[PDB]
Design an enzyme around this catalytic site. Sequence first.
Site, PDB file in Angstrom:
ATOM      1  N   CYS A 260      13.806   5.706 -42.246  1.00 55.38           N
ATOM      2  CA  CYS A 260      12.828   6.790 -42.080  1.00 55.38           C
ATOM      3  C   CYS A 260      12.966   7.777 -43.207  1.00 55.38           C
ATOM      4  O   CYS A 260      14.047   8.321 -43.416  1.00 55.38           O
ATOM      5  CB  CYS A 260      13.026   7.544 -40.744  1.00 55.38           C
ATOM      6  SG  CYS A 260      11.906   8.999 -40.550  1.00 55.38           S
TER       7      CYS A 260
ATOM      8  N   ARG B   4      13.320  12.191 -42.406  1.00 59.41           N
ATOM      9  CA  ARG B   4      14.457  12.670 -41.628  1.00 59.41           C
ATOM     10  C   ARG B   4      14.910  14.096 -41.936  1.00 59.41           C
ATOM     11  O   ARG B   4      15.782  14.633 -41.246  1.00 59.41           O
ATOM     12  CB  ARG B   4      15.643  11.708 -41.763  1.00 59.41           C
ATOM     13  CG  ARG B   4      15.571  10.492 -40.856  1.00 59.41           C
ATOM     14  CD  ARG B   4      16.760   9.594 -41.088  1.00 59.41           C
ATOM     15  NE  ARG B   4      16.689   8.920 -42.384  1.00 59.41           N
ATOM     16  CZ  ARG B   4      17.727   8.335 -42.973  1.00 59.41           C
ATOM     17  NH1 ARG B   4      18.907   8.359 -42.368  1.00 59.41           N
ATOM     18  NH2 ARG B   4      17.584   7.730 -44.156  1.00 59.41           N
TER      19      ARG B   4
HETATM   20  C1  HEM Z   1       7.854  13.926 -38.939  1.00 58.83           C
HETATM   21  C2  HEM Z   1       7.616  13.272 -40.088  1.00 58.83           C
HETATM   22  C3  HEM Z   1       7.973  11.780 -40.330  1.00 58.83           C
HETATM   23  C4  HEM Z   1       7.707  11.117 -41.468  1.00 58.83           C
HETATM   24  C5  HEM Z   1       7.002  11.709 -42.709  1.00 58.83           C
HETATM   25  C6  HEM Z   1       8.171   9.751 -41.325  1.00 58.83           C
HETATM   26  C7  HEM Z   1       8.091   8.749 -42.270  1.00 58.83           C
HETATM   27  C8  HEM Z   1       8.409   7.415 -42.085  1.00 58.83           C
HETATM   28  C9  HEM Z   1       7.980   6.276 -42.896  1.00 58.83           C
HETATM   29  C10 HEM Z   1       7.056   6.329 -44.130  1.00 58.83           C
HETATM   30  C11 HEM Z   1       8.522   5.172 -42.372  1.00 58.83           C
HETATM   31  C12 HEM Z   1       8.310   3.738 -42.864  1.00 58.83           C
HETATM   32  C13 HEM Z   1       7.399   3.132 -41.792  1.00 58.83           C
HETATM   33  C14 HEM Z   1       6.901   1.788 -42.235  1.00 58.83           C
HETATM   34  O1  HEM Z   1       6.812   1.563 -43.481  1.00 58.83           O
HETATM   35  O2  HEM Z   1       6.589   0.957 -41.337  1.00 58.83           O
HETATM   36  C15 HEM Z   1       9.305   5.549 -41.207  1.00 58.83           C
HETATM   37  C16 HEM Z   1      10.025   4.714 -40.379  1.00 58.83           C
HETATM   38  C17 HEM Z   1      10.771   5.087 -39.278  1.00 58.83           C
HETATM   39  N1  HEM Z   1      10.828   6.349 -38.682  1.00 58.83           N
HETATM   40 FE1  HEM Z   1       9.902   8.047 -39.446  1.00 58.83          FE
HETATM   41  N2  HEM Z   1       8.739   9.630 -40.068  1.00 58.83           N
HETATM   42  C18 HEM Z   1       8.636  10.853 -39.417  1.00 58.83           C
HETATM   43  C19 HEM Z   1       9.080  11.106 -38.126  1.00 58.83           C
HETATM   44  C20 HEM Z   1       9.935  10.339 -37.354  1.00 58.83           C
HETATM   45  C21 HEM Z   1      10.485  10.666 -36.041  1.00 58.83           C
HETATM   46  C22 HEM Z   1      10.152  11.960 -35.257  1.00 58.83           C
HETATM   47  C23 HEM Z   1      11.279   9.644 -35.652  1.00 58.83           C
HETATM   48  C24 HEM Z   1      12.116   9.481 -34.351  1.00 58.83           C
HETATM   49  C25 HEM Z   1      12.393  10.474 -33.482  1.00 58.83           C
HETATM   50  C26 HEM Z   1      11.270   8.646 -36.719  1.00 58.83           C
HETATM   51  C27 HEM Z   1      11.960   7.451 -36.762  1.00 58.83           C
HETATM   52  C28 HEM Z   1      11.688   6.367 -37.580  1.00 58.83           C
HETATM   53  C29 HEM Z   1      12.241   5.037 -37.415  1.00 58.83           C
HETATM   54  C30 HEM Z   1      13.248   4.513 -36.366  1.00 58.83           C
HETATM   55  C31 HEM Z   1      11.641   4.205 -38.542  1.00 58.83           C
HETATM   56  C32 HEM Z   1      11.908   2.712 -38.792  1.00 58.83           C
HETATM   57  C33 HEM Z   1      10.705   2.050 -38.119  1.00 58.83           C
HETATM   58  C34 HEM Z   1      10.788   0.563 -38.259  1.00 58.83           C
HETATM   59  O3  HEM Z   1      11.905   0.072 -38.579  1.00 58.83           O
HETATM   60  O4  HEM Z   1       9.745  -0.110 -38.040  1.00 58.83           O
HETATM   61  N3  HEM Z   1      10.440   9.111 -37.707  1.00 58.83           N
HETATM   62  N4  HEM Z   1       9.213   6.918 -41.081  1.00 58.83           N
HETATM   63  N1  LIG Z   2       9.340  -5.098 -35.585  1.00 58.77           N
HETATM   64  C1  LIG Z   2       8.845  -4.591 -36.505  1.00 58.77           C
HETATM   65  C2  LIG Z   2       8.288  -4.016 -37.516  1.00 58.77           C
HETATM   66  C3  LIG Z   2       8.382  -4.564 -38.793  1.00 58.77           C
HETATM   67  C4  LIG Z   2       7.773  -3.929 -39.871  1.00 58.77           C
HETATM   68  C5  LIG Z   2       7.069  -2.745 -39.670  1.00 58.77           C
HETATM   69  C6  LIG Z   2       6.969  -2.198 -38.395  1.00 58.77           C
HETATM   70  C7  LIG Z   2       6.219  -0.907 -38.162  1.00 58.77           C
HETATM   71  N2  LIG Z   2       7.164   0.194 -38.408  1.00 58.77           N
HETATM   72  C8  LIG Z   2       6.605   1.458 -37.922  1.00 58.77           C
HETATM   73  C9  LIG Z   2       5.309   1.771 -38.657  1.00 58.77           C
HETATM   74  C10 LIG Z   2       4.896   3.126 -38.165  1.00 58.77           C
HETATM   75  C11 LIG Z   2       3.627   3.316 -37.630  1.00 58.77           C
HETATM   76  C12 LIG Z   2       3.272   4.572 -37.155  1.00 58.77           C
HETATM   77  N3  LIG Z   2       4.159   5.570 -37.219  1.00 58.77           N
HETATM   78  C13 LIG Z   2       5.398   5.361 -37.734  1.00 58.77           C
HETATM   79  N4  LIG Z   2       6.274   6.367 -37.800  1.00 58.77           N
HETATM   80  C14 LIG Z   2       6.022   7.586 -37.320  1.00 58.77           C
HETATM   81  C15 LIG Z   2       7.173   8.287 -37.629  1.00 58.77           C
HETATM   82  N5  LIG Z   2       8.010   7.434 -38.276  1.00 58.77           N
HETATM   83  C16 LIG Z   2       7.454   6.217 -38.401  1.00 58.77           C
HETATM   84  N6  LIG Z   2       5.776   4.146 -38.201  1.00 58.77           N
HETATM   85  C17 LIG Z   2       7.582  -2.833 -37.321  1.00 58.77           C
END
Ligand code: HEM
Ligand SMILES: N#Cc1cccc(CNCCc2ccnc(-n3ccnc3)n2)c1
Lengths: 407, 411
Positions: free
Chosen positions: A106, A109
């Site tokens: 993420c 963070r």
């Molecule tokens: C508030 C502004 C936030 C921004 C700008 C942001 C940004 C991002 C971005 C760009 C990704 C990559 C997603 C992808 O390419 O699929 C990501 C993934 C992720 N975010 Fe955030 N995020 C935010 C908030 C949060 C919050 C509030 C949480 C949890 C409480 C969180 C937890 C995660 C997790 C666990 C991933 C990995 C998702 C996956 O593996 O599919 N994020 N985030």
């Molecule tokens: N399993 C799985 C799997 C593999 C590749 C990408 C995926 C999507 N990951 C989250 C994408 C997504 C969409 C909307 N919102 C956010 N999000 C919001 C805050 N942080 C992340 N992230 C899942």
Amino acid sequence: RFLKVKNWETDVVLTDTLHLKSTLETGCTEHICMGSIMLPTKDQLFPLAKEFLDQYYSSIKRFGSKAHMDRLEEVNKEIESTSTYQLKDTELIYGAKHAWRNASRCVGRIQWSKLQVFDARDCTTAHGMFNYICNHVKYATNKGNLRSAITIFPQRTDGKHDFRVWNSQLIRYAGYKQPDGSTLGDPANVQFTEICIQQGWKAPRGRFDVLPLLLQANGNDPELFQIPPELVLEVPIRHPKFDWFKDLGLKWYGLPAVSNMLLEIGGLEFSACPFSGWYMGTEIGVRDYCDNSRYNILEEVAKKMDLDMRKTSSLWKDQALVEINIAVLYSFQSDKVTIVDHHSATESFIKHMENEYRCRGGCPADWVWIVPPMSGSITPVFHQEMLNYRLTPSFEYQPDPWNTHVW
Amino acid sequence: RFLKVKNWETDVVLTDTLHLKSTLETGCTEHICMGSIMLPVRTKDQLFPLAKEFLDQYYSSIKRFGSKAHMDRLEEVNKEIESTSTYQLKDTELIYGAKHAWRNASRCVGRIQWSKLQVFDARDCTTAHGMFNYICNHVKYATNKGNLRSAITIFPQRTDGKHDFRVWNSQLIRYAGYKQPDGSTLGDPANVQFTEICIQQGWKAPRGRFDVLPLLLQANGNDPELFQIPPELVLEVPIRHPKFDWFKDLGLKWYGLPAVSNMLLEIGGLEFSACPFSGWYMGTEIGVRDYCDNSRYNILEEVAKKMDLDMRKTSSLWKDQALVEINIAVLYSFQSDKVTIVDHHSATESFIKHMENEYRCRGGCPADWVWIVPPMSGSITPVFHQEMLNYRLTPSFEYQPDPWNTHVWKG
Ligand code: HEM
Ligand SMILES: N#Cc1cccc(CNCCc2ccnc(-n3ccnc3)n2)c1
Ligand code: HEM
Ligand SMILES: N#Cc1cccc(CNCCc2ccnc(-n3ccnc3)n2)c1
Ligand SMILES: C[C@H](O)[C@H](O)[C@H]1CNc2nc(N)[nH]c(=O)c2N1
Ligand SMILES: C[C@H](O)[C@H](O)[C@H]1CNc2nc(N)[nH]c(=O)c2N1
Ligand SMILES: [Zn+2]
């Protein structure tokens, strides 16, 4: 075993001590790196609780306190009696914030400690689940001034009474398979759009139909609910330069809300824990719009721009990619919906790394995911070495419910 | 064991058995991934099995494993090692070695070409002047009037680590960098230190923005000597844009021949500390990294101004917009002057095919996603969507320290 990380643009070096705490495995070995791979009892439970309470109690400057040792005994007893245990509201909030803090993929963070935690452990039904989710959506959206939030449903018990949100995100557009082999709407959701329709759902069969919620409570069959449209904030996509862009007929939703992950805290498993922040522009413009297995609009846009698409060498795709991403940013900004560009977000992640190294001794990070999918090396994260490792509490992936559910 | 890699755009799944042959370490553990870390006098004791492992491969490749020629060769190498503490590779083994080191180079996206490599054997070389001569021939041959040909020149192997051959330049052709007393920088900032050394060594610097550096060459462990590559051997390309006519007035140009000269080539336990190799450029190396890295020529500002972009806020994506036009200009200028170049779309696409072929014919293809994915427009290239396994095979190209940090000065 005290590792250093170097930024090659600034020559700034940070020393990492936090990794030594990590307990779960990476999937890598001394012989092979799997960094680019997408997917990596009573006796088990108490040390897990202990590790969490130790860090909880350390975090509040009462390590080894009476209250510390007391909470420890108390939890130990409840595990021995019930084979599980219940978190205190304070521990729950701490745990959730730290799962975010520990999410090495993420980029947002830096905001980790400002999370709004909604305790939904008293929930018993899908209707109840829907209600809690509408409340999450309304609160998080805040009329376009987005606020980070998570809603936490009851923790797993036997594994046959799991709470699950079947949607991968709370808000996504439908995907339909046409007769001419093509795909209308979002191809990523063709299968889920199928199940929703399989279960009832009158599909408007448009390019952008908001999917219905499919909610599972206590391991029962899932139920369809339609989010009140007045709660789903959407943004029409126009370009600040190209008047024809309007006529592409594109839009996106403002609330990015992941609903399919599993939250682990002190050994306890929360299989239903939808969370939301706000979009980085590239998620929509680069991935959602221009990925080949998604909306794949590059050609259509380049056509409209009258570019020489006869040779890859013209970089017509790159040129279109930029404009599209300009449009997304412009549109959200114009309509007052929170959004962050890849430059600002990566810059803020760098400062966050600085902060974490300074106050915590490190920050786990997945370079492969942190680096934006466009303009990689003109963002500072590109030149930043990062160490990836798994700390707890965590958000983990989990199987899709329709492969698992005793239907 | 068997490992699967998946392309998430095509669902194509490939199986890797080749990683089993890996011996060297990655830097990672079960508990930490160091995949984004940039950088993560041998005794007869260890040398022969290294020789044998290589000779077993080579003889398998030529379908003579277990032959008398294979067995006699092992015998000959073993005898020569214990008598002389080292051994010499045949010409055939050297060529095989050099090609396979390229083939095994997980950070090189250009590996589809691995089998077409021109190997120049410079193991009879004894002096720096001799090195200059060999290197001139390499440049002339590789350049080929713009029709670039991949080549490597291999100087004598290490003996006691006190008589190393070294090319002190990081690349055969590179521009000088000069730190001004006001803190600013003239030319390529990446080369300030090296430029300073050459000047100290007697180089008379023109002090311009694109001065081709002299060759600083070390033979047999002796102090290094300066040489100027004949300018008619250095092919350069003035950079212009196909639509923007003010672009030529930026005064940019670049050299046509990309040639790495600071790496170490390992084959059968032998160490070749001087082994300059050259291919041809992927456009982004120049347009993105060379020109647009903040720590390099860093032209984004001046270009964006001349484009009259809204430079007041990052959200306009003025940097992204300028970056594209620059890369358009680099590809345009090279193609217009018939100097070999490849765009990042074409090159990544070919790499996927190469990779798929390697998995089928070889059982795998070690690749570093972090380096393979181009530094712009990442996810609109297919490599972004390709899972890759990274591991180390020999023969191999390895990093080695900069010679000015280790060299013992004779005086
Ligand atoms: C508030 C502004 C936030 C921004 C700008 C942001 C940004 C991002 C971005 C760009 C990704 C990559 C997603 C992808 O390419 O699929 C990501 C993934 C992720 N975010 Fe955030 N995020 C935010 C908030 C949060 C919050 C509030 C949480 C949890 C409480 C969180 C937890 C995660 C997790 C666990 C991933 C990995 C998702 C996956 O593996 O599919 N994020 N985030
Ligand atoms: N399993 C799985 C799997 C593999 C590749 C990408 C995926 C999507 N990951 C989250 C994408 C997504 C969409 C909307 N919102 C956010 N999000 C919001 C805050 N942080 C992340 N992230 C899942
Ligand atoms: C034929 C055209 C070639 C192309 C298009 C190509 C492409 C590339 C690119 C873009 C890089 C990344 C460089 C960087 O970002 O610093 C690279 C690295 C590398 N290439 Fe090539 N290459 C070619 C030929 C060769 C040849 C002939 C060899 C050796 C015989 C080779 C071996 C390597 C090695 C060892 C690296 C790693 C360099 C490092 O880690 O600093 N390549 N290649
Ligand atoms: N150590 C180190 C280190 C860190 C970042 C970049 C670096 C240079 N890598 C090679 C750059 C380069 C230049 C010209 N040509 C080529 N080249 C030629 C064929 N393949 C690559 N490669 C080294
Ligand atoms: C194969 C590769 O690991 C995969 O395509 C990854 C690359 N990096 C990513 N980075 C982000 N932020 N999101 C993604 O889905 C991916 N996909
Ligand atoms: C820290 C990070 O590993 C470093 O900036 C890497 C990233 N990927 C790269 N990829 C290529 N091709 N060349 C590079 O110099 C780098 N630098
Ligand atoms: Zn790794």
